Design a protein around this ligand. Structure first.
Ligand code: NI
Length: 183
């Protein structure tokens, strides 16, 4: 199983390269990797297991974070109670259309690869449409808004060597743009 020992931290060259597209079908090893990436998110949300391995709770992980420059990502957002849940393993994910309006988390953004916390708000698109392939090569299309949209753009940014703190305005970090929504 993947543990914090497999997560490379900020400064490692792989987090800044541009992940390679995957050729379908995936090799046996690539499926195992993607499946283990998701299993990591599950483990990190399980209080028991998470505490044993010291895993930080998280809802998204990109392949580049475990030193695999490939365009695969796993996202696991639990049911916040409103029934809406998100459990996806995506291959060659691609944002094909998005909103002009912006959105952002109040508390800023974090990253398992970044040990120390960062200040500013991260302004992303409030709505996006993603086209990607599932673990078996079939087509998946997602329309997302708000938080879920934020999570996916975060993970997708890794595939292009972009870190969340790259978006923060070196000016008023804590200052929201002229109206992008909150959350
Ligand atoms: Ni991150």
């Amino acid at each position: 199983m993947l543990t914090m020992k497999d997560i490379i931290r900020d400064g490692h060259p792989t987090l800044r390269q541009k992940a390679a597209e995957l050729e379908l079908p995936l090799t046996k090893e690539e499926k195992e990797t993607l499946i283990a990436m998701r299993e990591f998110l599950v483990n990190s949300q399980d209080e028991e297991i998470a505490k044993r391995y010291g895993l930080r709770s998280g809802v998204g992980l990109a392949a580049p974070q475990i030193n695999i420059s490939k365009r695969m990502i796993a996202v696991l957002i639990p049911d916040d109670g409103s029934g809406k849940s998100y459990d996806y393993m995506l291959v060659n994910p691609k944002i094909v259309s998005h909103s002009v309006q912006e959105a952002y988390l109040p508390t800023g953004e974090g990253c398992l690869s970044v040990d120390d916390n960062v200040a500013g708000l991260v302004h992303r698109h409030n709505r996006i449409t993603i086209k990607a392939k599932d673990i078996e090569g079939n087509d998946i299309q997602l329309r997302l808004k708000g938080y879920p949209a934020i999570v996916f753009q975060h993970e997708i940014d890794h595939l292009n060597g972009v870190m969340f703190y790259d978006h923060i305005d070196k000016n008023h970090p804590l200052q929201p743009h002229t109206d992008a929504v909150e959350v």
